[PDB]
Amino acid sequence: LEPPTVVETLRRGSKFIKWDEETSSRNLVTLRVDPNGFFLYWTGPNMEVDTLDISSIRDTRTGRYARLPKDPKIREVLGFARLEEKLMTVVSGPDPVNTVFLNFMAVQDDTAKVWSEELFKLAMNILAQNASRNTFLRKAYTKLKLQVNQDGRIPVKNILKMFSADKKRVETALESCGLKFNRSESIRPDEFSLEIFERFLNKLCLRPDIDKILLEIGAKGKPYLTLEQLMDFINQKQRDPRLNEVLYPPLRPSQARLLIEKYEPNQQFLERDQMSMEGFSRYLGGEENGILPLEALDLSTDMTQPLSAYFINSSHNTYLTAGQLAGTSSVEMYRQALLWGCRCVELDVWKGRPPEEEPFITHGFTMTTEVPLRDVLEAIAETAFKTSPYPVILSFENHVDSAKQQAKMAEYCRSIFGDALLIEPLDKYPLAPGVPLPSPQDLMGRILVKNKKRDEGTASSEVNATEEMSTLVNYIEPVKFKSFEAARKRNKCFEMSSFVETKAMEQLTKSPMEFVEYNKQQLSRIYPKGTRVDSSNYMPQLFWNVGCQLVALNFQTLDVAMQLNAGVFEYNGRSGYLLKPEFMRRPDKSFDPFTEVIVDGIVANALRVKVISGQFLSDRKVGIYVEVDMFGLPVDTRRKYRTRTSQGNSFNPVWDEEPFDFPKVVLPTLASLRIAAFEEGGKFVGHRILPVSAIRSGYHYVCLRNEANQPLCLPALLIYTEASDYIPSLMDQRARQLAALIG
Amino acid sequence: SIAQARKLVEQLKMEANIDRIKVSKAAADLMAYCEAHAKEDPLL
Amino acid sequence: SIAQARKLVEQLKMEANIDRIKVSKAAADLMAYCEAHAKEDPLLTPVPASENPFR
Amino acid sequence: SELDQLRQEAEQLKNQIRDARKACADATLSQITNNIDPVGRIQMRTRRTLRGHLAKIYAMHWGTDSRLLVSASQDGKLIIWDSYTTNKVHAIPLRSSWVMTCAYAPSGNYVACGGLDNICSIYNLVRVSRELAGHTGYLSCCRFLDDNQIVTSSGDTTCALWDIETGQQTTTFTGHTGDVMSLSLAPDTRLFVSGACDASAKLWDVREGMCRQTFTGHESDINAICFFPNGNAFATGSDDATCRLFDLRADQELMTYSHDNIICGITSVSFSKSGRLLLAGYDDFNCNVWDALKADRAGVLAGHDNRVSCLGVTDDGMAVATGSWDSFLKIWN
Amino acid sequence: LDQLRQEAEQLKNQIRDARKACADATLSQITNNIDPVGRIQMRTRRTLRGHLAKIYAMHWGTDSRLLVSASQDGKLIIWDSYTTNKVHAIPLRSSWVMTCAYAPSGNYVACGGLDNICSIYNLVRVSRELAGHTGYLSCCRFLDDNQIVTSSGDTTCALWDIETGQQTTTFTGHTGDVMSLSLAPDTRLFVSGACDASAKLWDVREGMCRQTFTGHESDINAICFFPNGNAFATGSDDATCRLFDLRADQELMTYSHDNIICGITSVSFSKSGRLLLAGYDDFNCNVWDALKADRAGVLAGHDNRVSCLGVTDDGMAVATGSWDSFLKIWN
Ligand SMILES: [Ca+2]
């Protein structure tokens, strides 16, 4: 983990010919990156500095992966032998389906390999995605300082647009701090400094949410805390009490002296070991008072366990970008999937044409648009390991019938994937009855193939494989599911059996304990039914709660199910692998998942989320209400909680009501919070999905993301969590429990 | 360090030679002040 | 390596033994030039419209 | 053998101080004002609400003619209000953003300021007319004697009397240990008291620059002070939620205004015109007006939402203005 | 390498105390005894339409009638400032031009750009094709009928011979990109401004970097040479002009102001050397005084960024080329 560092060849600049295939118009701009590592600004075509949020970059592909120009007007201008090493395209956008391109082209040699490697390092950096609150206000000040007009000054039409809840405050708050406050005038960029913009935001909003904290910690009449009143503010109110204090040591009066000397503005308080009120309104959104600690965000999990004991992020018919009937399949959707953190994709290989025999991808019997197979595996082998080095599981729906297309698609995977295609069993784990699967460590950097060795939609009419395609299937393998007592008696842990959403609900509730007892040895993927033709998603928490691994969603339509499966896989270093909790992967001590009581062996937790307030939540003057879900085992799932809608009074509302309790959660390393904040009228604003065993207690700022887990600049909440340990007709017995979870 | 404390000795020695005004006449004079101005008060 | 730093001194070596004149004469050479040429420069004072070719 | 032989006398005469109070312990106001009828039930109403500030109001001060009031805020904006017609007469900005005091003149053509930047900046009625630097602590409260001399109270445990024509600490006062949070003047301006942070109320004589009387009694901070209008008694705030009433003649505390269901501490004290009422502020956003000679609540002035930071009746006692932390400086009557 | 660092820098402080020993009176002190020029206003006399994209460079002729311009379309156009008749129309083979020039004979017009190669046109077709820069070309100026000095982006300059087409002397010594250059009216020395804030003064006779000048804190975009031959004025991206001398070895004025923030693009002097016509980035050209450091009029006439200037040898008028395909001639 490193803070975002800008290398010297990005701060000064290079010269890039920016072109666009739409209007066929290319300028000559000089790219820069500001020294914080926030924006990518260049002086525009009519002398107005554009930007691009560097956290809103999904990939920066260069070289042979880039987008070449197809218009001979632009092609004769840029000069199209080896000069496709100076190109650079920077894709962006909120969702996978909506991506914009910025087709640059460098003018000096070997300056595009340097840039596109050092822009992808700045877009996928953890500490500039889980950053502080005070960092996310310097990311909204640098946006205001870069975009000057032609004269070179900051226009006041931009400060009245960014903080635009009511512009009668901003016209007043600019006029009282000593700037030019008219609608058409300009502020010079060296009289609009960070000490002034900090004084701008204090005059803008009124903060009783902070001031309610300053009465409970003892600051009564003097405008400063002591060192002692802060040293037992952290160790009494903001310390996670599940953890062992011998390994996580409490705060010392020599260690808290640095927290004063890092934040306190005045000098008469710095030498006396005292922190003022502005020093405490700076500390609450500092880089130590975060909602999550940095042990549950980097690659720190026991990666030695076998492959049957992991949540693997996966997908279902991931080549589609629309509904399952009359959509349009693409090949860019794989690159956006495998970069997000997916680890199991789906390919529907169909028989090609009688002119020339090569396979391709489409949905069966729906006349959806077709993409060719050869360019899919090149869009897989390129970007399989750009964000996470942990193995990818291809999952064919082999529907062809000719023998020559079977061998041709076998020669493609042994050529495009190179040595990353696992064609041989490992030395340590051979395929015999009674062994376990490999670990992700020993498969790190490899690619497996899932195919038959030697309401289903289309996956039931599948063909018998041949001797060439069956050579690649080594560890993960599909076999038609017969029974449970046949599976455990046979004990081949290199088998798997797919289940649709319907036929796995008939086997979630009929016998859940034998399902988990089978899901410690073997695999079983879960993919939704064919009657969700608008590509909506079932909840994945239905089938993690019995320990299925590859629970598959539709990555194109981001409802609350797909906003879960990209907020619970942001942890463990965005690697797409999460370790199952201990009693779901251990061959001795089993448990019923539907337990209304606690289990002897898992410690239980208790949670009390209080949603106090939240700043800068919307562009228009309207009320905000906050929903606090908590998914988990079916005795943990509570989806009824909501605050009351505020009045929309100012930039920050204040909710003053009772906290939301979660008293007895039986399995807390499986549960996960969710704090969504809506507009009054169903319009989304933000959400953040937190795990339960890792969340700290105390007063924190939750900085909201959008619906695809990209950080929003301005909006946040100020919530107060309080975690602590716990001190105390078969179908309708179970179908009445899951109805809080199905929705 | 003793000169800080030797200021306090001259601080408290002047507290010995102060005339004692007892609370009998003094608190009744505070009683007599509220009665002599009892109708010149726009917050009653 | 060393040779670019060698010639950096050797280029700076001839910069040492240079000669000068005072700025009081340097600001007097410039001040002689403008006032001896201000009678005919057509941007300090305008010209008649007949001799002016752009009107 | 020397550092111990002073402490035997450093607490010898202090025991004669309290034993002098036992000889003077004759009566309290509970046993001498028990035949005095109370004032009944006191109700007020929000007469005028002076919108126009942008952040927390931290101080105020009435004028001399009971008409104009100043109000320094946390955004750094002195506004000189007109109470009769709801008018912002001036609006002086500041070069010191963090303010904690304000003042006015007895003649009425000068204003002051102060705060965290250790500088007291007299203005003219608008430009920066003077400047007073020399404190090594935060400025907390400053008052005027006349057009020439100005007292302050600072965070470097020292009060200071200044001269406005030179701009130097002419007389400096020492003797507290903690911070000095508020001060007030007698109506003759012959002797002024101030309350510290470490639970003391010391009286400084202005003509000599040396204390003559030291009070005790509190167990926590002191955050306000104000005089009885005859100049022989005064009253403080606290953090332990009890105001007091000291006797400058009798050197002893006389009456505590303690009450149950009262946990928030005072942040502002000021008497009334005839000295029957003691008003106060709290952290329950109310303004409990206390009767003086009975030690009892008599009315609640509840019109705010965030805490009360300043309070004060006029020089004739007609109105009363409370300035809270919601930028809303009301006027009650 | 340890001994080389200190003895080089020790002479670099031998410059400063020699500079401080010379700095007896800065130029603002002596010129106070002379009245300023007051106000001077120029109007748009002619306007030159016919270009299609952004205009990058221009250079008047010594016969003081024609000029030239080099647009982003790769459309080199030779204008006539008397009748507004396009006398020629020369289409390039590389549309990324960045500069152009003009010869004192009037017979040769050069134009090069991002394509690293300085083409030379006859007055029509190319005669000589001058190549040898391994970076982009930024500015070039003619000496005479046969010699041209270019300024690449490979941290060098050059001194060509177009009858042969080979580089005679490689004027090296810069540490960053070379942005613009300017010959002398006696055609014996020239200057060069960089992206290292380093003006210079070379000589065409021997090939050596004769003097070196620093002082700015940003890039240097354009430098003009004084009509005496004694001074040269530069322009930086810190919104300032300065004025050096070859003898005083230091900045003599500093033509800055508040409410001027964006950079500069092109400067030049008048016929006498009294004015100093800068062309800024906020679309206006200012007129300073070379002695008084006060403004004397703004040429608020363009609608996009002003990117090149040039003042005739006869001193009749100036011309400003912008990014909106327009050449305005101001007198
Ligand atoms: Ca399918």
Side-chain angles (χ1 to χ4, degrees), chain D residues 1-33 36-40 42-50 52-145 147-167 169-189 191-248 250-284 286-333:
Chain D
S1 278
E2 181 42 65
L3 279 87
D4 58 43
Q5 88 174 47
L6 78 94
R7 269 72 168 267
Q8 309 321 284
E9 276 103 317
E11 325 302 314
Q12 167 203 59
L13 270 163
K14 180 176 171 63
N15 291 162
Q16 199 253 339
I17 291 300
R18 290 182 301 174
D19 213 8
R21 282 175 195 171
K22 316 313 189 63
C24 293
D26 186 279
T28 188
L29 276 74
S30 308
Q31 58 198 78
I32 203 165
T33 77
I36 299 285
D37 44 338
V39 302
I42 288 175
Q43 188 251 319
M44 288 173 195
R45 48 171 173 82
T46 301
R47 204 173 76 134
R48 286 96 195 258
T49 303
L50 308 182
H53 272 297
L54 214 70
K56 320 191 182 311
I57 299 185
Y58 259 110
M60 60 145 286
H61 201 296
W62 276 102
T64 304
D65 48 36
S66 158
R67 191 177 162 100
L68 285 148
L69 55 89
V70 295
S71 88
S73 154
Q74 197 210 51
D75 66 355
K77 203 168 174 292
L78 263 74
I79 311 172
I80 303 175
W81 304 85
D82 194 28
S83 88
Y84 275 65
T85 61
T86 305
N87 274 124
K88 322 175 192 176
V89 180
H90 312 82
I92 311 184
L94 290 167
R95 48 169 57 248
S96 88
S97 192
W98 291 90
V99 197
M100 258 177 280
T101 176
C102 199
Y104 202 80
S107 297
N109 207 359
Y110 278 141
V111 81
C113 198
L116 273 194
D117 287 305
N118 310 62
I119 44 185
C120 186
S121 73
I122 302 102
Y123 296 155
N124 180 281
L125 320 173
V126 286
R127 306 139 284 269
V128 186
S129 158
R130 296 292 299 169
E131 195 97 348
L132 303 186
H135 279 314
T136 39
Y138 67 99
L139 203 57
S140 162
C141 190
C142 47
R143 284 289 187 265
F144 274 30
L145 290 90
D147 291 332
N148 43 8
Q149 276 174 278
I150 170 176
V151 295
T152 55
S153 306
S154 44
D156 55 5
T157 177
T158 37
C159 310
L161 161 66
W162 301 65
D163 50 353
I164 213 165
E165 87 296 330
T166 298
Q169 307 204 3
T170 287
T171 319
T172 318
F173 317 102
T174 57
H176 278 320
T177 318
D179 301 339
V180 176
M181 271 321 288
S182 291
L183 85 166
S184 82
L185 295 174
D188 52 29
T189 324
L191 68 164
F192 82 106
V193 306
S194 174
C197 178
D198 59 330
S200 188
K202 283 182 192 174
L203 154 68
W204 317 108
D205 204 341
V206 201
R207 285 133 196 186
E208 60 174 71
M210 183 182 287
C211 164
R212 83 164 66 179
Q213 188 136 326
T214 296
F215 289 88
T216 39
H218 281 296
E219 290 99 32
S220 53
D221 307 341
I222 282 181
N223 274 331
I225 205 154
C226 166
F227 257 84
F228 208 63
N230 87 281
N232 277 23
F234 64 95
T236 79
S238 181
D239 168 70
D240 67 86
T242 72
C243 313
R244 299 281 196 166
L245 200 172
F246 302 100
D247 208 317
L248 278 175
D251 215 346
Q252 189 211 67
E253 190 263 0
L254 278 191
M255 186 58 76
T256 169
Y257 302 150
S258 189
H259 201 73
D260 298 8
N261 198 8
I262 295 301
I263 319 297
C264 296
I266 315 294
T267 64
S268 44
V269 192
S270 43
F271 273 99
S272 166
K273 178 62 192 65
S274 194
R276 179 84 208 196
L277 306 185
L278 185 89
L279 278 78
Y282 280 92
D283 287 63
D284 79 342
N286 301 353
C287 300
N288 303 45
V289 175
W290 298 78
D291 193 312
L293 285 68
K294 275 301 190 36
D296 48 353
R297 282 190 291 119
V300 189
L301 275 69
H304 290 297
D305 68 333
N306 204 355
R307 39 175 277 170
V308 157
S309 184
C310 43
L311 199 149
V313 312
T314 43
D315 288 331
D316 58 345
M318 202 174 136
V320 175
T322 71
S324 198
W325 284 12
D326 56 346
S327 309
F328 268 42
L329 170 46
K330 307 205 152 176
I331 297 173
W332 301 64
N333 187 27

Side-chain angles (χ1 to χ4, degrees), chain A residues 317 348 397 458:
Chain A
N317 281 343
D348 302 354
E397 296 184 4
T458 77

Side-chain angles (χ1 to χ4, degrees), chain A residues 540-655 657-703:
Chain A
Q541 266 284 345
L542 283 170
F543 295 114
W544 291 340
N545 279 335
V546 282
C548 293
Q549 304 94 337
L550 307 151
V551 169
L553 306 199
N554 297 320
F555 264 52
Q556 48 262 14
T557 76
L558 297 94
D559 71 339
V560 76
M562 191 39 212
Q563 288 154 14
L564 184 84
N565 209 2
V568 76
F569 278 136
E570 200 199 9
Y571 312 107
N572 197 12
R574 217 199 310 262
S575 313
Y577 273 74
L578 255 70
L579 182 81
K580 273 163 82 172
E582 186 193 341
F583 278 176
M584 295 172 84
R585 53 172 216 271
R586 208 150 269 263
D588 46 19
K589 292 178 283 294
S590 173
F591 81 128
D592 197 297
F594 286 79
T595 59
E596 305 274 326
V597 309
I598 66 168
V599 191
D600 40 356
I602 308 114
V603 291
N605 286 125
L607 210 57
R608 283 200 90 87
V609 168
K610 182 180 187 293
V611 183
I612 300 175
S613 91
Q615 309 103 27
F616 302 137
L617 266 167
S618 177
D619 260 347
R620 42 175 305 265
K621 192 180 59 184
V622 68
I624 300 300
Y625 60 94
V626 160
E627 305 189 324
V628 186
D629 282 334
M630 179 177 191
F631 306 94
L633 258 60
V635 307
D636 289 345
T637 292
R638 284 187 269 270
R639 298 184 36 79
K640 75 198 273 290
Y641 289 90
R642 205 171 61 84
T643 85
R644 276 183 290 273
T645 84
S646 88
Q647 285 82 29
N649 56 337
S650 291
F651 307 98
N652 54 332
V654 171
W655 304 284
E657 44 92 31
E658 59 265 3
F660 310 124
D661 59 345
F662 302 117
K664 182 183 71 181
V665 279
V666 188
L667 184 52
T669 52
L670 194 41
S672 41
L673 213 63
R674 169 176 187 270
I675 305 155
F678 289 91
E679 276 187 11
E680 201 198 16
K683 167 77 185 74
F684 212 87
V685 160
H687 90 301
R688 182 150 177 196
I689 286 189
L690 309 170
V692 171
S693 200
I695 179 172
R696 321 189 154 194
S697 157
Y699 294 91
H700 301 80
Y701 286 101
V702 166
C703 40

Side-chain angles (χ1 to χ4, degrees), chain A residues 149-167 169-174 176-178:
Chain A
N149 54 5
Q150 51 199 237
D151 192 350
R153 317 145 76 83
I154 297 174
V156 190
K157 215 170 56 179
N158 279 359
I159 316 183
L160 266 78
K161 186 186 77 177
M162 160 172 290
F163 314 108
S164 193
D166 60 337
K167 302 151 155 219
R169 292 280 294 186
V170 175
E171 288 181 31
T172 310
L174 280 153
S176 68
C177 67

Side-chain angles (χ1 to χ4, degrees), chain C residues 4-50:
Chain C
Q4 63 90 32
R6 276 284 263 265
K7 194 40 85 176
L8 176 48
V9 191
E10 303 291 336
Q11 180 248 313
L12 270 155
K13 185 55 74 172
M14 41 165 194
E15 308 312 312
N17 48 318
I18 62 169
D19 42 355
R20 293 185 204 216
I21 46 183
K22 289 307 168 188
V23 195
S24 51
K25 207 80 205 79
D29 260 347
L30 270 79
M31 258 293 307
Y33 197 43
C34 298
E35 275 78 9
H37 286 68
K39 327 172 305 292
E40 86 265 34
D41 184 294
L43 265 159
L44 289 189
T45 168
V47 287
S50 44

Side-chain angles (χ1 to χ4, degrees), chain E residues 1-127 129-204 207-246 248-249 251-273 275-331:
Chain E
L1 206 75
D2 42 26
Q3 52 179 352
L4 272 298
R5 293 288 177 179
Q6 190 138 340
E7 67 200 40
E9 199 259 357
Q10 189 265 332
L11 271 303
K12 289 194 77 173
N13 308 101
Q14 190 56 51
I15 307 301
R16 327 289 166 97
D17 72 323
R19 276 185 196 160
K20 278 189 203 172
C22 191
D24 57 346
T26 170
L27 192 145
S28 158
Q29 310 313 285
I30 303 105
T31 179
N32 206 338
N33 318 327
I34 306 306
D35 50 306
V37 309
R39 295 286 293 273
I40 182 74
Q41 313 267 25
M42 295 140 305
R43 325 216 169 274
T44 299
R45 298 295 174 92
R46 324 289 296 269
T47 308
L48 283 71
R49 294 174 187 86
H51 275 289
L52 266 299
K54 303 167 289 169
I55 282 178
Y56 272 148
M58 70 161 313
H59 196 295
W60 287 85
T62 287
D63 46 336
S64 191
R65 181 189 180 118
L66 306 104
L67 55 93
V68 75
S69 283
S71 285
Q72 202 76 285
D73 210 353
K75 188 68 66 66
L76 195 71
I77 295 307
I78 295 183
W79 303 83
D80 165 87
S81 174
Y82 279 171
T83 74
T84 320
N85 282 55
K86 295 159 195 163
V87 181
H88 297 261
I90 317 182
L92 273 302
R93 66 156 293 250
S94 175
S95 164
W96 290 109
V97 313
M98 287 276 280
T99 174
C100 62
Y102 205 89
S105 156
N107 62 336
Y108 275 155
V109 172
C111 171
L114 278 186
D115 214 350
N116 312 332
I117 295 150
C118 204
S119 51
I120 284 178
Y121 284 105
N122 180 27
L123 309 180
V124 307
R125 282 170 293 169
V126 57
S127 159
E129 187 88 13
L130 303 204
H133 296 301
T134 78
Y136 71 98
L137 180 53
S138 83
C139 191
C140 85
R141 307 290 184 208
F142 271 128
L143 264 163
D144 47 52
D145 298 350
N146 294 317
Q147 288 166 97
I148 172 176
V149 286
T150 71
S151 52
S152 169
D154 206 39
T155 78
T156 64
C157 292
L159 171 62
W160 295 88
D161 202 350
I162 74 181
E163 199 64 36
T164 80
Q166 216 174 12
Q167 265 174 342
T168 290
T169 318
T170 312
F171 284 125
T172 180
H174 280 272
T175 81
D177 263 345
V178 177
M179 284 290 180
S180 289
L181 79 162
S182 197
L183 278 182
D186 60 308
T187 76
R188 302 216 299 186
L189 328 174
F190 65 98
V191 293
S192 200
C195 70
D196 317 327
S198 62
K200 267 178 179 298
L201 172 77
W202 315 69
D203 56 64
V204 301
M208 45 188 175
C209 168
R210 189 157 171 82
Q211 317 195 6
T212 320
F213 295 78
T214 180
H216 282 304
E217 68 165 339
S218 297
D219 289 356
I220 281 186
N221 284 351
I223 298 188
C224 170
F225 217 83
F226 204 64
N228 220 23
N230 273 321
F232 68 96
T234 178
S236 66
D237 272 14
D238 201 46
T240 66
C241 268
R242 293 193 191 190
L243 199 148
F244 302 100
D245 194 273
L246 319 169
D249 206 76
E251 37 187 339
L252 260 58
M253 303 296 283
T254 302
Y255 308 126
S256 184
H257 186 223
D258 282 8
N259 306 146
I260 287 179
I261 292 177
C262 64
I264 208 171
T265 39
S266 285
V267 304
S268 281
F269 279 99
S270 158
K271 173 173 202 168
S272 81
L275 299 180
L276 193 145
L277 286 97
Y280 278 174
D281 202 275
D282 59 89
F283 302 176
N284 302 8
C285 301
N286 298 14
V287 171
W288 305 97
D289 192 284
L291 302 170
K292 306 304 188 176
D294 290 26
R295 291 153 86 166
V298 293
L299 291 90
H302 271 301
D303 217 329
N304 215 337
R305 202 271 296 271
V306 172
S307 75
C308 47
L309 276 80
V311 185
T312 80
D313 307 332
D314 293 30
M316 280 317 101
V318 306
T320 75
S322 53
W323 273 22
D324 56 353
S325 298
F326 278 163
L327 303 154
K328 299 211 171 307
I329 291 176
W330 306 80
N331 166 48

